[model samples]
Target: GLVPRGSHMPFVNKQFNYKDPVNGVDIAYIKIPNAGQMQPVKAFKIHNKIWVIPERDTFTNPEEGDLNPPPEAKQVPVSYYDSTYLSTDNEKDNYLKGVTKLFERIYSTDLGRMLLTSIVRGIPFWGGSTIDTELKVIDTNSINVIQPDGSYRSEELNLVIIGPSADIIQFECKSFGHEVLNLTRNGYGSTQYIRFSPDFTFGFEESLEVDTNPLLGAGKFATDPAVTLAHELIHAGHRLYGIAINPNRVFKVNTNAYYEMSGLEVSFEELRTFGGHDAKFIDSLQENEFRLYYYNKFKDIASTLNKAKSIVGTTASLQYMKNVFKEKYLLSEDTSGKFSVDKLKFDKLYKMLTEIYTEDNFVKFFKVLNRKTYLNFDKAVFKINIVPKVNYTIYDGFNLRNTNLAANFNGQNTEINNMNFTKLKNFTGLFEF
Candidate 1:
């Protein structure tokens, strides 16, 4: 039996979905069944480009042990996050209304529709995923659902919106939220579910903003629901064509440890761990390139046509391209910040990864990155995603380690790690790329 539909929340559920004539798709705004059980107040697109809304939790710092948020997590200004629509003091009506207006305004323009349409259409690049099937009125199995059965139970089309042409995917875009998909892991999901998502079933922590980094709002992980939803929707592009890779091993290093920048430092953070059959995460290097390419390509449209000013915040996302990609990765240390895609190793990585990861490969990357020889791979099926090995190569300027001694995808200073190493004479640690 499917959950009942047609029960609309005030302003959010009140308005009809916006139709994108250019892409021939309509953006549906709907809620899941069992809000009491699922309890979410953020928005995100799951595998396909469908957005779900569910927000919760009072805002606070991460309960100790959670990875530290960006530099400004503590410095987040409450006033900025306290607009009338996003007011913490108010109940759901105003914030929901604000989010409703935000999306309506965003999708009304050709630029907004086109950018979102392309995301659904999927990237045309070699290894990129593309749209696979046509839309149809289907069962909940096609989409993830919310329920009280301690597992997913809702159907995609049930309570959700309806339009001439629309599809569904279920993910939650949030402000500093808690999600421990794995309960067994050390820093896993909440032991007790004060509030949670039926689909993923984790702590379901809420940030000030439903907007994730791709959709940055107030500096302190604020939720600009409308902008955030679209940004995550862009990630759905990776799924449309069935290139289902996981970031499972992406953060395996556990700790972002480092050795003396002045000495030989190492960390397996860059080594790709096992990713099932789907090609493991290629590398953030290429992701950075692809994202930056799209940012500059459509930033102006986002600002001018969509009436979204400061849409991309500088947190290693598309908007952060100016500093993160151009200034750091692609160019020489000239303050100019410039580059040509062909000359970039990250771009090369993009090309290689997109071309290599296909159904025909029957391939899987490494499983655990802790091993010293994690980079070893057999071309037949195991494709190595060596983050450290490539950067370690003596590729002049931007490619290799310089006196700067900064490492990590975002490039942090290694001096501190080096200092820590010096304190312990007997300390032997792995080096970083």
Candidate 2:
């Protein structure tokens, strides 16, 4: 016997009542079913013709581990090759081979030589990954690139070979071996690569569950580890010679500004506008002055951390200093006088990190130090969240706050009084972190 829709079952029956204070009316509601248990159900309002899904008891259980459980597979070893060519049925092996080819090509190219020279001369050369050598390959199973006709052309998988140098290549493969239809209809999917690098690793399962669609073709290529290797190899070439690459750097600084408004004062747009003409003037006259003031006052405490590397062993003392520096300089503070100054200096450092440093440089520095590795295929995640507010009024007029009207208006008259006339600020001198 088929149960009628909206029929209340003993376990499923649920209701609630509430009073509307503004309308001075009592409201009552009941749960109703529409179709199968798995199908979405809608509720009908008794008084009004509105329909809504009432909140119900949902059964959920935490996985065995919190999340980010260690990889189930054992780590595979990856060998470094300079000019040697290698082959393997494993996707990781192919990826490593591709990376070696990429590095050789980049090193041999005229543009690559010029770029390296430019870097040595302190002239920034755009392109190249700081943390990892990024690679991409075009294949049949590649994600589709949306076309004008509302149809998508299959896109080759963008294989990312991430690592500090050419010697080690970290492979992140994204592709399927079998046809999407087969997995859906047959209720099973197979992986192409049975062997992976002993040193190489993956984040998630190799295969993903997908729905079967009749519109799609059935004779699609199954997972081929060789194809994946080839795809990653192509990616290595792209990363090496591809015109679109930007290396960046990050620096921390100490300055005179409110901690809350650290990186807020001078923005990327403002810097770009002022960088060409008045960059030197602003840095020499403003940023430098603020930095000197903070450094001088906090020399004892700050100098210890900065100089700790020289005193204690590089490994032990350096880590300790970094920790202390982070807590003292990076952390925010509130209150008047020295506390406020501390906060402002921290803000200035943060500002320099975003405005002055290039992304590539920052990533590279961490990679070189072995402090962090770049995940070429995975997007870098910055843990810091900073909200910047625009205060255009400060630079609007020929002489901003000339009459001290803005200062007094914002209750910042004290700041104006303490302005040091001897020292000048220099944004250019700020070092990258």
Candidate 3:
């Protein structure tokens, strides 16, 4: 069954300063109304509706005078969408459960927690900037089939094969096939949604461990469904934070410091986190040329025993890793009385991430996350006008299908006047932690 969409409950949309667990900074997050409660409230906007979890999961009844809506706040519809398999209520619940666990995993790590907090609160250098995009979820359909050899064979649904070499050519045009997740903007504004695709449900049904030993070919951390979701989360964070080339744009990367680092070639970890063949394309494109030396923030968590196994490098005990984290990043004594507990934690987290991804590389990851605006790493020029503004037609751009059938394909006819999509100025790069 599809999760209930357009469902309404007595909810409030207010601004509240939530303390960042990692940095101890109080970031203001908009309180979105929802049915259920999360112990540590989580709030985000989806379209006009704000979904919040302040106590438990899902929706719940509001207490006396707790309702934010007026007296007529009756059965308003809530967010609902079908899983790729059109799964039963049980499967749907399980998928959400998995998401909850993954979120917990992220919150546990210094790097992961920073990723979550930074999305809401801009990094320290940027001060008061954030992404105001409304997030939505559209069901993923597999457009290409996956072969046993782990390569994707494109599915011919809705595809026009026009050339004579259709038989001999490997079109390989799998849209939302296995291991492909995308954060696509719905239109010109900041409305976007993540398509989990067949990628999420494959290897994550049981475990979310990232095995990165030399035995696994590249010896770098391979992504699971869990990290891929984090990948899309990073994409959303980038857009939300408005990290882009046009620093003069309303939401821009305002800074005088270049904070650039070089030599970010293939000596870094493997780029397989973006799915199989896509990794090849990402790697081949001298991605490092425009690349900042900032480290991509995955695989630092030792939350689960499996993660501990991969991160700690041997069959070290779970408590050993926990103690290491506590001693190095968490429990370090602040002999000086001037440092607040939050500041201490923030500095420790800062140091840990800097040591892992290098202070420079972590800053560079922000550039890799620009929206439709393509970046030229070599010249560092930006192409701002390639993909036009997709109207609120169907959620039909970049291999995505709208969540609602009634509104599918209802695109507006808009014209482009003398717009230049060519090379703009070089993006003067990132900041140091």
Per-candidate TM equals 0.26, 0.16, 0.25
The best candidate in terms of TM-score: 1
lDDT of 2 by residue, 1-433 (tens): 0011232222112122211111111122221111123332122121111111222112011121121213435322222222121222232233333333222222232322233222112101111122222211213222222333444333222121222122223233222332332211111111111112222211111111110111112211111112223223322222221111111211111232221234313322223212222233244444545445434433333333333323222223434434433443343333421222255654564343223332222222111111111111111111110011121121211112444423322211112322211111111112121
RMSD of each: 22.6, 32.5, 24.0
Q: Which lDDT tens digits does candidate 1 get at residues 338-364? A: 233334544443332233322111111
Full-model lDDT for every candidate? 0.25, 0.24, 0.24
Q: Rank the candidates by TM-score, best first.
A: 1, 3, 2
Candidate 1 wrongly placed segments (more than 4 Å): 1-90, 109-111, 118-227, 248-433
Ranked by lDDT from best down, the candidates are 1, 3, 2
Candidate 1, run of 10 with poorest lDDT: 377-386
Model 1 C-alpha lDDT versus the unseen true structure: 0.25
Better of 2 and 3 by lDDT: 3
Cα lDDT, model 3, residue 49: 15
